[PDB]
């Protein structure tokens, strides 16, 4: 492999807040990455980082930022116990405030229905409202997403249990991650039931539904701070307590350092359909990283030994192409063909 | 060939084994035993450098204060001189003091 | 000097080999038990007093004697056999340590052990503005710089017994002087530490404590409680974490290990 430095770059500081890349959101095509650092939505551009606009709507430190799946608005949450929505041209419309400081973000697919977890509810922003419809529950709600296709989202609760409600915050799913209550959830934006149930303990729970796994749920060497689906499911970039983002397999077996950074990636989220991926460090240092996976082979004129899913190799057998990969379970580095 | 019997056999290995068990025991606590192991050597001073093993016998058995090796070995640091004359000039003037 | 008397210890009992090199390596044997890097742990809310050192008089007398060739008595080495006297430490013999140390500290009324010992004797026997007087003719001595370290084991003495007199910022920034004749200061950075402590600034105190733990051997549970103690308060959710780990490389058994940051363990991770 090689996973080049796409660009990396230290936030600047204004409001006198911590510089903490707290949470990173994607505009839908990649194009905007934008990083909610301190108490401001710094948004840079993830194929260059140039702070195309430092948004500073927030009076405490924004815990968390989402922009919309559909790609209109992003928002900001943060301690003030308010959200300030900033539309695709960055500017602050609504700015609603809630009952407890923000936990996190996440918007409809559908349409522009930011859902903002506070502390004990969760204020679903719709695209125009200045209102906070609620989700009281007894459980903290830590986490939140929406699933792609519009109709879900996911309040995981502060008692090990990821209760998955509606656009009116029902009860519905009683998701068995364990003891650990799981901050870090997210449903991909290809994937409406594919659960990343990222965790302290190092658990790399991929849940479904109901609250089963997807594949083995891998105990990380590194407690993570958050853990997302590289290429829409088949990679997997982990960051946590690690310094940096590794690549894995949707096994769970290594691939390669994507990130080479200063401090904790307290947020990751791969560049969507893209090589790249959002890594925002404690110093706020935001970093895309080219992820371009090389067809690595060996070829003795008729088994051309490409490796694909970058632990195995899908040798295909030219004269038959017989595309059945070889199952090593662990990454290629070179590979010939007698 | 070599020296005669079995645990004399690989006399050339054995030789370093003893000169390298005199270089540990020099530095360990045991010089007398490393005297008694470069007296092994002094049969095989030939395949080593012999100016090596004259002078390691000498400069730590005298120091040892063993009177007659201490004769002995200002004999060796005055007559036939192997030891480079600088330092055999000096213990020649120290069996010049001593003897 | 970086704390690792292990190898150290391995290291100089081989070096009993030769008479002048081997004589300076026996004397750091036995000038560690009373000073490896530098002692000056008389802090507010800190003391210092060996009666387990019983033992240590007895060892320390025993390897004093083996120093090789003109050690066997030196103001050095006599000040160390008065060290391994209070060493001795009971109350009665501390005084007695302290007047044979003033037959030998009265004679050099500017150098730092002798002085240095008067202080420690003067301060376990609660007299500090008697060991204020000893340290700061300490220094009575121009700047010279042959005891550098041991003149700023001088200074954070006197600063924490200014400590003890109730102002704190002035040892503060005497151990942040400590930090320029030694790299690895980790009393000095727990105290200094403690002192920011006071004057209301908590994440450069843990910072420090970590360097100590780091400096200590894997130390830091009453130093790692005021870590998570000051990584807790600052309300970076994410935080003390760090400080999870490095207090668990400290001690796997840390008691603290979720009450000042399991506040920040799961109530935080993108929070």
Request: glycine fraction near 6%; charge should be neutral.
């Given at each position: ?10 936030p ?7 510089n903490?890349?707290?949470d990173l ?18 948004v840079?551009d ?36 308010t959200?300030?929505i900033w539309?695709?041209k ?29 502390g ?5 922003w ?8 609620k ?5 903290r ?41 799981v901050?870090?959830?997210?449903w ?16 790399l729970?991929?849940?479904m ?9 891998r ?10 689906y ?14 940096t ?28 359909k ?9 110093g ?18 008729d088994?051309?030994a ?33 | ?19 390298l ?9 045991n ?26 016998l ?42 | ?22 004589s300076?390596?026996?004397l ?12 000056a ?16 008089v ?12 003109a ?18 430490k009971?109350k ?5 340590s ?18 240095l ?17 000893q ?20 200074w ?44 209301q ?7 420090h ?40 490389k ?22």
């Open positions: 492999m090689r996973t080049v430095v796409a660009w990396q770059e230290t600047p500081e204004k409001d006198g807040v911590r903490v890349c707290y959101c994607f505009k839908p095509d990649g194009s905007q990455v934008v990083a909610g650092i301190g108490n401001r939505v710094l840079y993830a194929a260059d980082g140039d702070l195309l606009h430092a948004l500073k709507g927030h009076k405490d430190s924004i815990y968390c930022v989402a922009y919309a799946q559909n790609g209109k608005r992003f928002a900001s949450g943060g301690a003030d116990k959200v300030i539309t695709s960055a500017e602050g419309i609504l700015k609603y405030t809630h009952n407890d400081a923000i936990q996190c973000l996440s918007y409809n697919p559908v349409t522009q229905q930011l859902a903002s977890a506070t004990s509810d969760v204020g679903l719709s695209p125009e409202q200045k209102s906070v419809a989700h009281k529950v007894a459980s709600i830590c986490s939140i997403s929406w699933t792609a296709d519009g109709a879900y989202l996911a309040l995981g609760c502060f008692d090990g249990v990821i209760s998955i409600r509606d656009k009116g915050g029902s009860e519905k799913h009683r998701i068995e991650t364990g003891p650990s209550p901050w870090s959830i997210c991909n934006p290809v994937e409406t039931n594919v659960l990343c149930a990222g965790c302290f303990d190092g658990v729970k991929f849940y539904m109901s609250g089963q796994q997807k594949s083995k749920d105990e990380l060497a590194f407690d993570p701070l958050c853990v997302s590289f290429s829409s499911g088949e990679y997997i970039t982990v960051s946590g307590t690690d310094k983002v590794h690549l894995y397999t949707r096994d769970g077996t290594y691939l390669t350092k994507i990130a080479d950074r200063d401090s904790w990636v307290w947020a990751v989220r791969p560049r969507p893209h090589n790249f991926v959002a890594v925002g460090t404690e706020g240092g935001i970093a895309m990283f080219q992820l371009i996976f090389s067809t690595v082979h060996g070829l003795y004129q088994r051309y490409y490796r694909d899913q970058m632990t195995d190799v899908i040798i295909q057998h030219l004269i038959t192409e017989q595309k059945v990969r070889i199952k090593c379970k662990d990454y290629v580095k070179k590979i010939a063909v007698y | 060939s070599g020296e005669a019997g079995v645990d004399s056999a690989w006399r050339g290995a054995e030789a370093y084994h003893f000169w068990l005199a270089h540990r025991q020099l530095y360990a606590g010089v007398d035993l490393a005297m008694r192991t470069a007296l092994h050597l002094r049969e095989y001073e030939d395949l080593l450098d012999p100016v090596e093993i004259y002078s390691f000498a400069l730590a058995a005298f120091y040892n204060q063993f009177f007659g090796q201490c004769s002995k070995a200002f004999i060796k640091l005055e007559s036939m001189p192997s030891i480079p004359n600088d330092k055999r000039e000096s213990f020649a003037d120290l069996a010049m003091s001593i003897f | 000097y970086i704390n690792n008397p292990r190898e150290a210890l391995k290291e100089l009992n081989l070096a009993r080999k030769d008479t002048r090199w081997g300076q390596a026996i750091h044997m036995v000038e560690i038990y009373l000073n490896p890097d530098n002692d742990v008389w802090e507010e809310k800190e003391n210092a007093d060996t009666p387990e050192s019983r033992q240590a007895a060892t320390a007398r025993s390897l004093l004697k083996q120093v090789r060739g050690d066997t008595t030196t103001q050095r080495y006599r000040v160390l056999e008065s060290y391994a006297i209070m060493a001795g009971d009665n013999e501390i005084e007695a302290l007047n044979v140390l003033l037959d030998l500290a009265n004679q050099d009324p500017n150098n730092v052990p002798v002085l010992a008067m202080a420690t004797g003067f301060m376990m026997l609660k007299q500090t503005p008697k060991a204020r007087n340290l700061k003719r300490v220094q009575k001595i121009q700047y010279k710089p042959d005891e550098a370290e041991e003149f700023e084991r001088s954070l003495l006197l600063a924490d017994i200014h400590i003890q007199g109730g102002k704190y910022d002035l040892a503060q920034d005497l151990c942040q002087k400590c930090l320029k004749y030694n790299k690895s200061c980790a009393k000095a950075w727990e105290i200094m530490g403690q002192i920011m402590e006071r004057e600034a908590y994440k450069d105190a843990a910072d404590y970590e360097n100590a733990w780091k400096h200590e051997n894997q130390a830091s549970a009453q130093v790692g409680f005021k870590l998570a103690f000051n990584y807790l308060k600052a309300r970076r959710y994410v935080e003390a974490v760090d400080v999870c780990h490095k207090v668990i400290a001690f796997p058994d840390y008691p603290k290990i979720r009450k000042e940051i399991l506040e920040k363990a799961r109530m935080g991770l993108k929070p």
